[PDB]
Amino acid sequence: VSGFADLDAFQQWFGRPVDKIIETGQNFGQDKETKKTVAKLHQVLRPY
After folding, report:
1. What subcellular compartments does it reside in?
2. Distance (Å, rounded) from C-alpha 25 to C-alpha 9?
3. Rounded distance, CA 35 to CA 9, Å?
């Protein structure tokens, strides 16, 4: 058992702050949640 990620769990991972916030650009620069999700994604996928 070396499972890493699940599709539905990845949907639950962050969730809306990775899909709908890009269209509403007034919040991506505000860094309420977009910056944290971007940093988490960079941390988790850059090695891979």
Report:
1. Nucleus
2. 25
3. 20
